[PDB]
From a paper:
The Type-IV restriction endonuclease (REase)ScoA3McrA (abbreviated as ScoMcrA hereafter) catalyzes multiple double strand cleavages 16–28 nucleotides (nt) away from the phosphorothioate linkage with the core sequence GPSGCC/GPSGCC. The DNA PT-dependent REase ScoMcrA distinguishes PT-DNA from normal DNA which differs only by one oxygen-to-sulfur swap, and presumably encodes a domain to specifically recognize sulfur on PT-DNA. Each ScoMcrA protomer consists of a head domain, an uncharacterized domain, a SRA-like domain, and an HNH domain. The uncharacterized domain binds specifically to PT-DNA whose sulfur atom is in the Rp but not in the Sp configuration, therefore we named it sulfur-binding domain (SBD).
In each asymmetric unit, there are six ScoMcrA molecules, which are assembled into three dimers. Superimposition of the six ScoMcrA protomers in the asymmetric unit shows that the head domain exhibits substantial positional variance with respect to the other domains, suggesting that it is rather flexibly attached to the rest of the molecule. In the HNH domain, two β-strands and an α-helix harbor the active site residues H508, N522, and H531, that are critical for its endonuclease activity. Four cysteine residues, C484, C489, C527, and C530, coordinate a Zn2+ ion in a zinc finger-like structure. A comparison of ScoMcrA-SBD structures in the free and PT-DNA bound states revealed that PT-DNA binding induces a rotation of the side-chain of Y164 in the sulfur-binding cavity of ScoMcrA-SBD. Of the six ScoMcrA molecules in the asymmetric unit, only two have clearly observable electron densities for the side-chain of Y164 and both of which are in the closed states. In these two molecules, the hydrophobic phenyl ring of the side-chain of Y164 covers the opening of the non-polar sulfur-binding cavity.
Residue numbers in the entry:
A (entry chain D): 8 to 26, 38 to 59, 77 to 107, 114 to 175, 206 to 560
B (entry chain C): 7 to 29, 40 to 59, 78 to 107, 111 to 430, 432 to 560
């Protein structure tokens, strides 16, 4: 297929009209089109590179380039934001150094927290040229023609750098009449946009397919949750908050890549996009959310081996704007402290259900247990003396107590009136049971084994919406305490 | 007194409200009624001013609300919003608040012809030029001089061209728009949402709203997706409307449907999909296309979206999605008087925004196929047959006149099977008649012959702790008929869906479903 040299020669002889780019002898040629004409002489790019040709990328969209403006740093975005405000107000494209300086230098002092604003303008006045933003022709015309793009770009810059939006930002800059009601309204995707593949998302907004946690073309963080099986979404029960597992595939996860970015977002209290694919369903950007707590937990990697993993507790919010965030969220930060809450202690990989064992090492009896129940009590007492308890403190479930109930019940219903239940396991190899509190956490009940009970689907239904739910609750409360106390002597 | 009062009003204008406080609706400007009466005299009182022919007012509802009250009474009620939209465009571009009829006429009349689908645009402007006054949005200066139509609500063309009266927006409204662009963008978006939802190229300019709304028009609309409220009252405080299930319209005049989950084992969402099955309006007897249902039908015809509120069980309300009416059906259900009744089933498809460009192809295809006509499923089944009607039964029917139900299920199933382009509604909405049949067959018991055991206790709502479920999933082409369905307890259902021996069980259930079905035919 090197005969494409003949196709290139005809592109030269007749012109672009008649004939991702392909570079040959200092000239650019449409990759797909050259491949097609060569055929007569979607895996095209590979074919051309397999022949000895260097393939170059198309010029990055204005949205992408303004999105690439990231810290290694408020200088660049301040200038950019001024430039957008200028273009929207029909100011001239090119302006002299002299006016830009003493027009932006006050902004640079007040919003870019730099001392010498005059000097502050010098850096981005030059550095922004090698960011392919310094405005350009096509960019200036884009902003003058399509105000959505101006509003989007400014919203992107405002989201990442000035998420707290201090009063007098929109004017002082040129942007008050443009951003108006709400600044992040111009951001895309819209809440509820649906995509089949992860690739489809990528095509539309960029970033990469790799990783749960990553930034889209706009430079705003995005976290992706894929439901593995049915009866298992990220949502922590009795609430609308998410328990999002962290970034590292296969071994003990670290504050690198996605987890790192999450931590950077946690510290400053910046929101992020939360994507979600229900089981047998499509992806969708379903909510903005804010890091409210981070913890460490035992889980399994892709190598099926136990591992330390991060648990990012996310709180959904209507938009990035902090004024729009409900008070439960705003209370959960500041209470956060931004520090890792660790797992081990009360919590051995089994302990909990996803690691089968005999137990082959007879070190621990199944009736320890007692170790789990103790940790559950300790943790419970410590939560019980929280003056202002966040919804996370209240509803996130202690692994140790769940573990204890599992060790106690041994794949059976603990309801002594059980009509009967199957001993078949699930596809994933767990019993068809659920551990549930007799006295709901929502109504003050404690997160401890003697307040919990293992139930088959049928008995669980009885407990939850059965006609005699109340009497059953009494019975279950009794038998839970009983079963608990039987394992202490 | 009347001309005395006019002279008093004229001096209030000359000097200003501050200097009047230093020393009643007329202009489109409000005047302190006691104070105006007093200056009229010596240079209640209320009775005197109303005696002389002046409209005496309370503090008008918010501009948002009043523009939202602009509602219709192939159908021509685009006059008022066309004028209003022009006026907002004018105010944003710093034009004068009051403008002569002459200019407004031949500035708006082309807009009226192009966007208001009226023939004579020049004549089209007359109606809202006057009618908008009594909507508390407009004012016309020397009104008394005009001669009205025989009918009431149009000044005649001759009288308008003669006097050339300076008319416009109200005072405070004009200042609101001139000061706060969010309010302009909101009002315009409202009008564009209800009229012109299919936003044609390019009305934003022509109207002088391009710079304000070009990016996306509905961005200025509130509430935002995901706003959460405790009560229905909390919603009402923030956005108006009434505490009616709805449709109800909020203050902005945009339709809003509210779904409140009754117990824990249901939401509106039709299974296997994200589309909603929303029960109509009208609390108690056979529902009619009146109130909310009427509005839903108007929205269905033109393919206009609407706000869908939802409160999960033991949870809070939230505006969770925009949605579009994709199909409407008639079904048997129970009213608030606990009695069987004919009710509407509005099949909603969620969408990201009101803009049609943003809607996915499944939605577009389903709308394309709709026909907008009522599908009456009420003939296929009886209120007996629904699980919420407790009964002996008969003597109309033995319980093995289940045969009746199964027959209707077949007939419907065959008719769906021959659909060339089947919408996701056609495929996934579940036939009551077949469900009913399974319920009459199983009689409050698990049909899985290997059932480990299940309780005979009922739910709080008085239904057995079971579920009817297809052995061959509809999603995988299985038919919506009783011999393809099976009644399972929670345990057996879990076994079916994610048990380790799911596959073998499916074969067993398929077999026993056919068997049980065929036992009732002989
Ligand atoms: Zn049980
Ligand atoms: Zn069963």
């Amino acid at each position: 297929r090197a005969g494409i040299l003949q196709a290139i020669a005809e592109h030269d002889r007749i012109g672009p009209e008649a004939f991702y780019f392909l570079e040959h002898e200092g000239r650019l040629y449409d990759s797909k089109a050259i491949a097609g004409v060569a055929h007569m002489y979607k895996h095209a790019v590979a074919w051309l590179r397999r022949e000895g040709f260097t393939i170059r990328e198309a010029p990055k969209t204005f949205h992408r380039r303004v999105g690439d403006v990231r810290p290694a740093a408020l200088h660049r975005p301040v200038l950019l934001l001024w430039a957008i405000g200028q273009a929207v107000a029909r100011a001239p494209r090119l302006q002299p150094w002299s006016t830009t300086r003493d027009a932006v230098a006050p902004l640079m002092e007040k919003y870019g927290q730099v001392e010498d604003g005059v000097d502050g303008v010098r850096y981005p006045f030059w550095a922004l040229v090698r960011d392919d933003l310094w405005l350009r022709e096509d960019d200036y015309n884009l902003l003058r023609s399509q105000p959505e793009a101006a509003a989007s770009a400014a919203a992107g810059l405002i989201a990442r750098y000035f998420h707290l939006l201090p009063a007098g930002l929109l004017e002082d800059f040129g942007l008050h009449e443009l951003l108006a009601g709400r600044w992040p309204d111009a951001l895309r995707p819209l809440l509820g946009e649906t995509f089949k593949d992860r690739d489809a998302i990528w095509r539309a907004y960029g970033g990469q397919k790799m990783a749960g946690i990553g930034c889209l073309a706009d430079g705003i963080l995005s976290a992706f949750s894929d439901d593995k099986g049915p009866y298992a979404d990220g949502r922590i029960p009795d609430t609308t908050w998410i328990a999002y597992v962290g970034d590292g595939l296969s071994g003990d996860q670290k504050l690198t890549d996605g987890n790192e970015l999450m931590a950077e977002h946690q510290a400053v209290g910046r929101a992020l996009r939360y994507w979600h694919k229900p089981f047998q369903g499509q992806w969708s950007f379903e909510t903005w959310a804010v890091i409210v707590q981070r913890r460490l937990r035992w889980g399994l990697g892709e190598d099926k081996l136990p591992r330390r993993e991060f648990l990012w507790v996310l709180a959904p919010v209507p938009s990035p704007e902090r004024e729009t965030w409900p008070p439960e969220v705003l209370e959960a930060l500041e209470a956060d402290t931004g520090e890792l809450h660790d797992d081990t202690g009360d919590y051995r990989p089994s302990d909990l259900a996803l690691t089968p064992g005999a137990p082959d090492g007879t070190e621990s009896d199944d009736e320890a247990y007692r170790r789990l129940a103790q940790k559950a009590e300790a943790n419970a007492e410590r939560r019980g003396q929280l003056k202002k308890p966040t919804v996370a403190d209240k509803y996130v479930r202690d692994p140790s107590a769940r573990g204890a109930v599992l060790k106690r019940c041994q794949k059976r219903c603990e309801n002594p009136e059980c009509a009967g239940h199957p001993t078949e396991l699930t596809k994933a190899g767990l019993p068809i049971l659920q551990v549930d509190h007799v006295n709901d956490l929502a109504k003050g009940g404690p997160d401890v084994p003697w307040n919990m009970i293992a139930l088959c689907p049928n008995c669980h239904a009885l407990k939850t919406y059965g006609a005699n739910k109340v009497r059953l609750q009494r019975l279950l409360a009794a038998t839970a305490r009983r079963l608990h106390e039987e394992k202490l002597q």
